[PDB]
Amino acid sequence: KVFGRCELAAAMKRHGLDNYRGYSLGNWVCAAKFESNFNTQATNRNTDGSTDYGILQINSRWWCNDGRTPGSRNLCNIPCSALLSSDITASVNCAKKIVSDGNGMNAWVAWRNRCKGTDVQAWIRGCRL
């Protein structure tokens, strides 16, 4: 599913991402925009054999199992395909585990290069939350 900007904003808030770990909803929408262009079915293979999945492009090397990633760990305890459904539950709950520690949203390269330090708040402007 390819989400509209405000449509994904409402769904994410509905899934408890607004201010999760101190990150306002704008961050998540902006991260989704640049990681997958709001497309839950986005996938990108990497040279290390891993693959990034879903709206937030979660990597299989550590968070999910796709049965072909070398030295793969499945910390979110799910098949990577679960990160591709129109139902964002899996991606959201896995992302919550990822952002909970480590380096926060700095875990998302696109968020770090296109959202961090900008009016991330703009991505929710005019939205029907």
Active-site residue (options: 7, 18, 35, 66): 35
Whole-angstrom Cα distance, residue 8 to residue 2? 9
Whole-angstrom Cα distance, residue 32 to residue 25? 11
101 is in an annotated binding site: yes
Active site residue 35: yes
Active-site residue (options: 7, 18, 52, 66): 52
State the DSSP string of 10-40.
HHHHHTT-TTBTTB-HHHHHHHHHHHHTTBT
Q: Which residues are catalytic?
A: 35, 52
Residue positions in the annotated binding site? 101
Residue positions in the annotated binding site for substrate? 101
